Amino acid sequence: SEKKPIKISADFNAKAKSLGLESKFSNATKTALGDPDTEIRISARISNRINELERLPANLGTYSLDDCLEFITKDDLSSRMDTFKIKALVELKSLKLLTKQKSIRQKLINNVASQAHHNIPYLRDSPFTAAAQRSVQIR
Amino acid sequence: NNVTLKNLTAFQLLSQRENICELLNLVESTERHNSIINPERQRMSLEEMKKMLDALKNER
Protein backbone atom coordinates (compact mmCIF):
# COMPACT_ATOMS: atom_id res chain seq x y z
CA SER A 1 0.00 0.00 0.00
CA GLU A 2 2.61 2.54 1.10
CA LYS A 3 5.57 1.08 -0.81
CA LYS A 4 5.69 -0.01 -4.45
CA PRO A 5 2.54 -2.07 -5.13
CA ILE A 6 4.14 -4.23 -7.86
CA LYS A 7 7.37 -5.91 -6.64
CA ILE A 8 8.49 -7.50 -9.90
CA SER A 9 10.50 -10.72 -9.59
CA ALA A 10 12.19 -13.18 -11.98
CA ASP A 11 9.18 -15.47 -12.55
CA PHE A 12 7.49 -13.76 -15.55
CA ASN A 13 4.21 -15.40 -14.56
CA ALA A 14 3.85 -13.33 -11.41
CA LYS A 15 5.48 -10.40 -13.20
CA ALA A 16 3.04 -10.65 -16.09
CA LYS A 17 0.10 -11.11 -13.72
CA SER A 18 0.96 -8.11 -11.54
CA LEU A 19 0.80 -5.84 -14.61
CA GLY A 20 -2.52 -7.11 -15.96
CA LEU A 21 -1.42 -9.50 -18.70
CA GLU A 22 -2.13 -12.91 -17.17
CA SER A 23 -4.31 -14.85 -19.61
CA LYS A 24 -2.63 -13.11 -22.58
CA PHE A 25 0.03 -15.84 -22.90
CA SER A 26 -2.31 -18.84 -23.07
CA ASN A 27 -3.73 -20.04 -26.38
CA ALA A 28 -7.41 -20.23 -25.41
CA THR A 29 -9.23 -19.43 -22.19
CA LYS A 30 -10.87 -21.95 -19.86
CA THR A 31 -14.63 -22.44 -20.15
CA ALA A 32 -17.25 -24.71 -18.60
CA LEU A 33 -18.86 -26.22 -21.72
CA GLY A 34 -15.70 -28.15 -22.62
CA ASP A 35 -16.21 -31.12 -20.31
CA PRO A 36 -18.22 -34.23 -21.23
CA ASP A 37 -19.95 -34.22 -17.83
CA THR A 38 -21.69 -30.89 -18.37
CA GLU A 39 -22.49 -31.95 -21.93
CA ILE A 40 -24.16 -35.15 -20.72
CA ARG A 41 -26.10 -33.14 -18.14
CA ILE A 42 -27.33 -30.57 -20.67
CA SER A 43 -28.29 -33.36 -23.06
CA ALA A 44 -30.25 -35.07 -20.27
CA ARG A 45 -32.17 -31.87 -19.53
CA ILE A 46 -32.93 -31.29 -23.21
CA SER A 47 -34.11 -34.87 -23.71
CA ASN A 48 -36.36 -34.58 -20.65
CA ARG A 49 -37.94 -31.38 -21.96
CA ILE A 50 -38.52 -32.94 -25.38
CA ASN A 51 -40.10 -35.98 -23.73
CA GLU A 52 -42.47 -33.76 -21.76
CA LEU A 53 -43.39 -31.77 -24.87
CA GLU A 54 -44.09 -34.89 -26.92
CA ARG A 55 -46.29 -36.40 -24.21
CA LEU A 56 -48.81 -33.57 -24.71
CA PRO A 57 -52.19 -34.11 -26.38
CA ALA A 58 -52.76 -32.99 -29.95
CA ASN A 59 -56.19 -31.50 -29.27
CA LEU A 60 -54.80 -28.68 -27.11
CA GLY A 61 -57.09 -25.73 -27.65
CA THR A 62 -57.02 -22.69 -25.39
CA TYR A 63 -59.86 -20.64 -23.95
CA SER A 64 -58.66 -17.05 -24.15
CA LEU A 65 -61.19 -15.17 -21.94
CA ASP A 66 -61.44 -12.55 -24.69
CA ASP A 67 -63.79 -14.78 -26.68
CA CYS A 68 -66.58 -12.96 -24.83
CA LEU A 69 -66.56 -10.12 -27.36
CA GLU A 70 -66.60 -12.72 -30.17
CA PHE A 71 -70.17 -13.94 -29.75
CA ILE A 72 -69.46 -17.56 -30.60
CA THR A 73 -72.67 -19.45 -31.38
CA LYS A 74 -71.41 -23.07 -31.07
CA ASP A 75 -70.92 -23.11 -34.86
CA ASP A 76 -68.30 -20.40 -35.35
CA LEU A 77 -64.61 -21.12 -34.87
CA SER A 78 -62.72 -19.26 -32.15
CA SER A 79 -59.92 -17.18 -33.63
CA ARG A 80 -57.58 -18.17 -30.78
CA MET A 81 -58.04 -21.92 -30.34
CA ASP A 82 -54.47 -22.55 -31.53
CA THR A 83 -52.24 -20.39 -29.36
CA PHE A 84 -50.85 -22.88 -26.86
CA LYS A 85 -50.65 -25.52 -29.58
CA ILE A 86 -48.60 -23.15 -31.74
CA LYS A 87 -46.26 -22.37 -28.84
CA ALA A 88 -45.84 -26.05 -28.00
CA LEU A 89 -45.04 -26.85 -31.63
CA VAL A 90 -42.61 -23.93 -31.89
CA GLU A 91 -40.72 -24.96 -28.77
CA LEU A 92 -40.63 -28.63 -29.75
CA LYS A 93 -39.37 -27.99 -33.28
CA SER A 94 -36.83 -25.43 -32.09
CA LEU A 95 -35.56 -28.01 -29.61
CA LYS A 96 -35.33 -30.60 -32.39
CA LEU A 97 -33.38 -28.31 -34.77
CA LEU A 98 -30.58 -27.56 -32.32
CA THR A 99 -27.72 -29.19 -34.23
CA LYS A 100 -28.69 -27.37 -37.43
CA GLN A 101 -28.44 -24.02 -35.65
CA LYS A 102 -25.13 -25.09 -34.14
CA SER A 103 -23.75 -26.01 -37.56
CA ILE A 104 -24.81 -22.75 -39.18
CA ARG A 105 -23.45 -20.79 -36.22
CA GLN A 106 -20.06 -22.48 -36.42
CA LYS A 107 -19.92 -21.93 -40.17
CA LEU A 108 -20.58 -18.22 -39.64
CA ILE A 109 -18.00 -18.02 -36.86
CA ASN A 110 -15.29 -19.78 -38.85
CA ASN A 111 -15.91 -17.73 -41.97
CA VAL A 112 -15.78 -14.50 -39.97
CA ALA A 113 -12.67 -15.46 -38.00
CA SER A 114 -10.58 -16.53 -40.99
CA GLN A 115 -10.87 -12.95 -42.27
CA ALA A 116 -10.01 -11.15 -39.04
CA HIS A 117 -6.69 -9.77 -40.29
CA HIS A 118 -8.38 -8.51 -43.47
CA ASN A 119 -11.61 -7.00 -42.13
CA ILE A 120 -10.80 -5.63 -38.66
CA PRO A 121 -8.76 -2.38 -38.73
CA TYR A 122 -6.80 -2.51 -35.47
CA LEU A 123 -5.73 -6.06 -36.32
CA ARG A 124 -4.95 -5.32 -39.97
CA ASP A 125 -2.88 -2.25 -39.08
CA SER A 126 -0.52 -3.65 -36.45
CA PRO A 127 3.09 -3.85 -37.69
CA PHE A 128 3.24 -7.57 -36.95
CA THR A 129 0.24 -8.61 -39.06
CA ALA A 130 1.43 -6.38 -41.90
CA ALA A 131 4.92 -7.86 -41.63
CA ALA A 132 3.52 -11.40 -41.72
CA GLN A 133 1.27 -10.74 -44.71
CA ARG A 134 4.27 -9.24 -46.48
CA SER A 135 6.45 -12.22 -45.56
CA VAL A 136 3.96 -14.61 -47.14
CA GLN A 137 4.10 -12.75 -50.48
CA ILE A 138 7.90 -12.83 -50.83
CA ARG A 139 8.56 -14.04 -54.37
CA ASN B 1 8.70 -21.67 -27.68
CA ASN B 2 6.07 -20.65 -30.22
CA VAL B 3 5.46 -17.03 -31.23
CA THR B 4 2.02 -15.78 -32.27
CA LEU B 5 0.58 -12.30 -32.68
CA LYS B 6 -0.97 -12.47 -29.21
CA ASN B 7 2.33 -13.47 -27.59
CA LEU B 8 4.27 -10.74 -29.40
CA THR B 9 1.82 -7.98 -28.53
CA ALA B 10 1.63 -9.16 -24.92
CA PHE B 11 5.42 -9.19 -24.64
CA GLN B 12 5.84 -5.71 -26.10
CA LEU B 13 3.04 -4.28 -23.96
CA LEU B 14 4.50 -5.90 -20.85
CA SER B 15 7.90 -4.35 -21.53
CA GLN B 16 6.36 -0.91 -22.12
CA ARG B 17 4.24 -1.08 -18.98
CA GLU B 18 7.18 -2.23 -16.86
CA ASN B 19 9.32 0.65 -18.11
CA ILE B 20 6.63 3.26 -17.48
CA CYS B 21 5.75 1.90 -14.03
CA GLU B 22 9.46 2.13 -13.27
CA LEU B 23 9.50 5.78 -14.36
CA LEU B 24 6.82 6.63 -11.79
CA ASN B 25 8.70 4.57 -9.17
CA LEU B 26 5.70 2.25 -8.75
CA VAL B 27 7.78 -0.95 -8.78
CA GLU B 28 10.43 -2.56 -6.57
CA SER B 29 12.76 -4.79 -8.60
CA THR B 30 15.45 -5.50 -6.01
CA GLU B 31 15.20 -9.27 -6.48
CA ARG B 32 15.69 -9.12 -10.25
CA HIS B 33 18.37 -6.42 -10.09
CA ASN B 34 20.36 -8.37 -7.48
CA SER B 35 19.93 -11.71 -9.23
CA ILE B 36 21.31 -10.14 -12.42
CA ILE B 37 24.15 -8.30 -10.70
CA ASN B 38 24.54 -11.10 -8.11
CA PRO B 39 27.23 -9.52 -5.89
CA GLU B 40 28.29 -12.97 -4.71
CA ARG B 41 28.95 -13.86 -8.34
CA GLN B 42 30.78 -10.54 -8.65
CA ARG B 43 33.14 -11.45 -5.81
CA MET B 44 33.65 -14.96 -7.21
CA SER B 45 34.47 -13.61 -10.67
CA LEU B 46 36.82 -11.00 -9.20
CA GLU B 47 38.76 -13.62 -7.26
CA GLU B 48 38.92 -15.81 -10.38
CA MET B 49 40.32 -12.87 -12.35
CA LYS B 50 42.89 -12.25 -9.62
CA LYS B 51 43.98 -15.90 -9.63
CA MET B 52 44.29 -15.98 -13.42
CA LEU B 53 46.29 -12.75 -13.37
CA ASP B 54 48.65 -14.14 -10.72
CA ALA B 55 49.07 -17.29 -12.81
CA LEU B 56 49.99 -15.26 -15.88
CA LYS B 57 52.32 -13.12 -13.76
CA ASN B 58 54.27 -16.02 -12.25
CA GLU B 59 54.79 -18.07 -15.43
CA ARG B 60 57.47 -15.62 -16.59
Binding site: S1, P5 | L23, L24, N25, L26
Partner: peptide, 16 residues
Protein backbone atom coordinates in the same frame (compact mmCIF):
# COMPACT_ATOMS: atom_id res chain seq x y z
CA UNK C 1 -9.58 4.37 -3.96
CA UNK C 2 -6.01 3.78 -2.82
CA UNK C 3 -4.73 3.22 -6.37
CA UNK C 4 -5.43 6.83 -7.31
CA UNK C 5 -3.77 7.87 -4.05
CA UNK C 6 -0.58 5.95 -4.83
CA UNK C 7 -0.47 7.14 -8.45
CA UNK C 8 -0.98 10.79 -7.53
CA UNK C 9 1.59 10.57 -4.73
CA UNK C 10 4.11 9.12 -7.19
CA UNK C 11 3.36 11.85 -9.73
CA UNK C 12 3.71 14.57 -7.08
CA UNK C 13 7.05 13.15 -5.92
CA UNK C 14 8.15 13.04 -9.56
CA UNK C 15 7.14 16.66 -10.22
CA UNK C 16 8.75 17.94 -7.00
Amino acid sequence: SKLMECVNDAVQTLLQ
